[PDB]
Design a protein around this ligand. Sequence first.
Ligand SMILES: CCCCC/C=C/C/C=C\C/C=C/C/C=C/CCCC(=O)O[C@H](COC(=O)CCCCCCCCCCCCCCCCC)COP(=O)(O)O[C@H]1[C@H](O)[C@H](O)[C@@H](O)[C@H](O)[C@H]1O
Ligand SMILES: CCCCCCCCCCCCCCCCCC(=O)O[C@@H](COC(=O)CCCCCCCCCCCCCCC)COP(=O)(O)OCC[N+](C)(C)C
Ligand SMILES: CCCCCCCCCCCCCCCCCCCC(=O)O[C@H](COC(=O)CCCCCCCCCCCCCC)COP(=O)(O)OCCN
Lengths: 90, 92, 147, 101, 30, 60, 488, 311, 40, 54
Amino acid sequence: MDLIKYFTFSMIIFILGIWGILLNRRNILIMLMSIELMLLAVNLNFLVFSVSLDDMMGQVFALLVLTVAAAESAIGLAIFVITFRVRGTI
Amino acid sequence: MMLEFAPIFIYLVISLLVSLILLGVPFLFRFDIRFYLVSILFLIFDLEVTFFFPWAVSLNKIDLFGFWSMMAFLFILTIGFLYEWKRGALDW
Amino acid sequence: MILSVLSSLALVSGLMVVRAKNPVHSVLFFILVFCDTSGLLLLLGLDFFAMIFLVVYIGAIAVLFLFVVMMFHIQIALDNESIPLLPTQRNTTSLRYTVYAGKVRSWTNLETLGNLLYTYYFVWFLVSSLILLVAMIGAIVLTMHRT
Amino acid sequence: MNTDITALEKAQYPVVDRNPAFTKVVGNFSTLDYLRFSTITGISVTVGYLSGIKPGIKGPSMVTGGLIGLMGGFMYAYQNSAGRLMGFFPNDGEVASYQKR
Amino acid sequence: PKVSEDKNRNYAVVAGVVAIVGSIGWYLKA
Amino acid sequence: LAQIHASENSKSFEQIEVERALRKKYARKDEDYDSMLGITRETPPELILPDNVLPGGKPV
Amino acid sequence: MFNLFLAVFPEIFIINATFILLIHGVVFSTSKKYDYPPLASNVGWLGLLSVLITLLLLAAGAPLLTIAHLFWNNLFRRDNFTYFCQIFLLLSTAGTISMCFDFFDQERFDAFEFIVLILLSTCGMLFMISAYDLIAMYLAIELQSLCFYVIAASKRKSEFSTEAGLKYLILGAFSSGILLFGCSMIYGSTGATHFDQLAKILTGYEITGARSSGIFMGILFIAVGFLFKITAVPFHMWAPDIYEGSPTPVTAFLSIAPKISIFANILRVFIYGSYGATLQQIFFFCSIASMILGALAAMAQTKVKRLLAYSSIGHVGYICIGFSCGTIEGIQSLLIGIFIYALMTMDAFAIVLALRQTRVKYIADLGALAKTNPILAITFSITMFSYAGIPPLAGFCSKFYLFFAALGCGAYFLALVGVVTSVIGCFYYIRLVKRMFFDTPRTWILYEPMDRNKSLLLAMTSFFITLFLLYPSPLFSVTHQMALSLYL
Amino acid sequence: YIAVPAEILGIILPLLLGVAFLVLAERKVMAFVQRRKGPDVVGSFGLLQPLADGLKLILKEPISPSSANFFLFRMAPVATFMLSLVAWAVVPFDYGMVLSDLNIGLLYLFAISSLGVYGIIIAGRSSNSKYAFLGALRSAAQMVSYEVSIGLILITVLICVGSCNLSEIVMAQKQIWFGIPLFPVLVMFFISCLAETNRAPFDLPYSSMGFALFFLGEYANMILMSGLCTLFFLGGWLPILDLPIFKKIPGSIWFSIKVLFFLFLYIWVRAAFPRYRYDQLMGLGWKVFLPLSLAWVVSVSGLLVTFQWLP
Amino acid sequence: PVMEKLRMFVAQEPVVAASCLIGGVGLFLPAVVRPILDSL
Amino acid sequence: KDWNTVFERSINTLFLTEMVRGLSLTLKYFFDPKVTINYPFEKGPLSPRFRGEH
Ligand SMILES: CCCCC/C=C/C/C=C\C/C=C/C/C=C/CCCC(=O)O[C@H](COC(=O)CCCCCCCCCCCCCCCCC)COP(=O)(O)O[C@H]1[C@H](O)[C@H](O)[C@@H](O)[C@H](O)[C@H]1O
Ligand SMILES: CCCCCCCCCCCCCCCCCC(=O)O[C@@H](COC(=O)CCCCCCCCCCCCCCC)COP(=O)(O)OCC[N+](C)(C)C
Ligand SMILES: CCCCCCCCCCCCCCCCCCCC(=O)O[C@H](COC(=O)CCCCCCCCCCCCCC)COP(=O)(O)OCCN
């Protein structure tokens, strides 16, 4: 069994991302790293399923979600930078 | 097909070993915002080059449609780059 | 074997990411997570996607997160769908049918993706382009203080 | 690349030259098409001129509005002409012109 | 002094007249 | 205090229109966008009263 | 080949117009000849013109929306439902742009990128409604999400705007991750992403033999993500804070435009995702909880914007009543409620922006409004009564027909909850009307006259609200036509 | 299968010897350019100088600056050494003389080059000197800004080949070398490699083995970029375009000769020109090379598509 | 006019003008020349 | 100014023609006799007036 192992690994990554979102409410950088872990787990699911089903609709969508994840990183870090300046703290 | 990455992994392991040997050789005896803008531009253009990677190789199958799709993609990012330019984000 | 260790290290790295005191160590384990995920993708035969994960995740996003954390403050903080096959492969390995018709002209993962990314699904490509343009525009307006 | 011009909803008017070329559609412009083209262009130019007075740019705003109106009016006229040729709009004159051809 | 000097304002007047005439024709011809 | 009133009640039509336009232009300010653009809009001298008529002589 | 693009002229025009506006603003804002002009109103007017022109392009070309449907099949699906939804979305965007003109002058918001980002969000929503795939749906959702994330924190110097932007960012990214995980689990269980394929593969096995764990969990995760998007409780984690901290012209747009497109997506998911009435139960609980919590939370609000946010949550629950009952009449009630709620919200936010010019923050601030401006008080009271659902006004028709749809399916428990929530809502809505007319505050606040755009918008919406019952036939006709076209 | 470590040793140890002798060659060529002679006393012609330097830096009795975490500081030179040497596993020297024949070699090289930013950053922060931290940040930004243009030039080259296999890019130049048509592209690639390595007018900037590893990694990067320049534009191991009678020369010699020519260009350029400023490095790299690289990609793709000259 | 504004732009922005020119050529070839060769 | 002058000075800007002129000079000095002296064996010229050890 290999599909089970891949799905279990991705599910654990997703759960860790959700935990980091919930546990680290005080810090902001972790609340972005957890989102990126979630997106990584989802991309891994899509790629594994595309390989398992022999279909190209998972690779195209993983490549397209790369862009969304990167743009979310950019906007999030910009918002964090401007947030620190105003209130002076995290 | 992917058997050619095992030499790379063994190369990484042996490079680690030789680096550790080298380290053990002498043992025997404020904030600037432009640094964020440059990283943002790098991320955008790295994604752009990532999208170039499939297009350049498969430019023989696609023909006069994939080329113009890539051209529209480039036009949009070029409008974005022009906005980056006139706003002074490219200056230091 | 290779899958088990390459998954265990990734789980430990992610756990350290979500439970790190110094955010720099969090960024480093964040990089290690994708370093392991690239190898996991390599085990699937998706050579292009592993390389892009190296290029994009730990080449652009991880560098950006490192820039933000460093220069700014360095402050403190199964049986239903696909039933698994039991390990009976002594006879299963012999029962492997290979069709040479699909091997005479084999496409790489790169050109297979590029065959339909730009012609049959080009609208989504342009939507991702628009998302990138939105990110470019929004980076300036939020963070820009000249002179 | 393989393409298909067939529509889900069939045309309710006589169809002449089901897949018209760009030059043929542009050459099919009628007086009404030019009227709506000019109306959209003039409205856009006037809006651009009026809106740009406060910032102090009358000419630049005029040209930007003119470009926007030119593009919009041309695509509206092209849409109407192509629909008339393809049978989606009442092509009273198109069938009269192309029956004698 | 029987000349309007502002070239940009004159073009705006011409465009407004054209828009009004075209709108009237549009409401009449269709 | 008579001097500012004298200087205001003797202006021509052309000067009055210019001063009205300047007063409208600088009525409200946006420091954030100016900081983004790297510029500093300063009130023209036509809209500045002498410091000798202010309540306590405010230079700024 | 060029005629295959007759189906995307409304989107091509708006994209190119946004590009032209961006170029114009960036070239002439950073100019020395004109002394860095603050050309936000210019770009706003030209963007409103562009929206009107693409509305003319989209509305006139009705027979041409199905052109080249086979070629565009894998990318998007255009039909009668998409046509009317997109026209309504463009109308709402134009109304919001019209309201936000006075914001750029008196408060001096000189950033022209606000209008460009609004136009790009509009493009994302246009691609959202016609999206007929999981991939396109997610891409459009992300596009509009980022366009809103950027403009939520537009007030960089404001403490509230940055915090609201950060919270909206985190919540939306988490919801998008949940939605994407659901989509991945659906794709890995059926092997299909297109809605036609995903309907053919799910319409037969209605959990008749066994429950597919992957499909069920994917459907549940997509439902949870969509409920986060519309902020239906308990998925309203930071919605009131986001609404309060966001700029008022921004808050007006997020209260109307995203909901229409997200509800269109939810409908185009229900056309295939009705997996044994699994979503009907989730939406049942969500609607009941949303009505109850909005009614019980908006009474303890002293600020106008928080009260508006909780009103939005309550009306989202009232609309989800229609989702709970899956029928043609249920969907018709849902769409009628969406239309009426959008119009009332536009009215209320135009009124708020009218008083925003004098820094209105509390309900007690609008105390002596019946004396200083005795017609604005009447208009605000009309809007509040329409929110309450008083029979003579237009807000009663939507609640009426939603209750009728709920009783048709036999869900008697929804009717009682809706009735009690309506009583509570009318109580705290007439509480505001008490302040304007009946109280006699010792200190008065005088507001400056409003501008022309918001004046006409208020006049038209107030004439619609009072006189809708006299001629409601076109709305019911178009709504019934839309609901049927979801399947045929 | 136990001979793979033999191949890795045979590709790694001569690389280090070549790096040391490249440092010697630089110090000799600059001396010859400036009307003097380089190190000559130590060896017959100074050939023994690098060995003396190595034994000197080994036998210094140095102290570890443990005023840090001591882990990231100690491993940053190790990481940059990792990245500098790992890129040599795919570069081919002749027809079948490559350690790892990837089918994604161009992208693997791009990834390896993009991952070289972390070593200098970690070294900059781990050193408690804030000024060294700022300098490392500036160097990282420069490397990033020019890696973008390097990737675009890689796209320009890849369009004409149609495959990311490095050994096939050379075979695609059997008709003519890509440096002849795309000469401006070759010049831009060389300048970008100059800026990528923190070298030439683009070179704005502790003790013992950390600095030794950083130095070795930088010079290995110089050698690798010379190899890439001769690999994408100068035909790799292919002989001279004309006069095919010298074919008795092995193909590995031609690759070496072209690499030495490009290394001579590195030394020449650094000796002949002054330094750029940081406010000019970023402006140049973002306003002169990104637009030009994008325009060259567009032009090459449009010309190849128009006449159906695609691979 | 045009021959003066274009000259002023080219003189002070040589690299941008060159990049725009080569990109315009690379876009002109598959737009105006490719259909011409398609007839033959 | 002249179109010819604009073209001529734009080419020199792009073709780096003022750096090739420096590279040529450095290379021409590369192939030249050296002026360094073997100090232990040959000494530099002096004068009879030289002031050294007392
Ligand atoms: C007693 C029985 C009759 C009783 C009935 C009488 C009817 C009289 C006949 C026609 C009435 C026409 C009504 C049409 C009125 C349109 C609105 C007026 C528009 C207008 O401000 O003028 C032009 C603008 O230019 C156009 O951008 C757009 C302007 C284009 C339209 C102007 C063309 C008008 C020609 C009309 C044909 C006249 C033909 C002869 C008519 C007389 C008969 C002999 C002047 O610009 P401007 O920069 O100097 O100044 C404007 C102006 O001051 C304000 O709009 C703003 O405050 C300012 O920011 C700036 O925008
Ligand atoms: C063609 C494809 C699209 C190409 C552009 C795409 C990007 C969009 C960029 C739009 C923003 C830039 C638009 C051009 C700005 C330059 C405007 C211009 O050329 O006119 C000049 C000057 O040129 C003129 O002569 C006026 C031209 C405007 C009138 C032209 C007629 C209206 C045309 C609109 C409809 C046609 C569309 C434009 C032509 C294709 C402005 O006049 P002033 O400088 O204010 O006059 C000086 C006198 N005084 C200072 C006292 C005010
Ligand atoms: C066999 C081997 C042969 C040799 C191979 C190696 C070649 C390199 C040899 C060394 C060459 C000199 C290296 C010097 C290194 C530093 C030089 C950098 C100077 C530089 O960047 O110039 C910029 C502009 O010139 C530039 O833009 C320079 C890039 C130009 C690339 C050429 C583009 C020409 C396109 C023509 C196309 C026509 C043919 C196709 C139709 C800045 O200059 P600035 O200060 O003025 O700032 C411009 C503001 N506007």
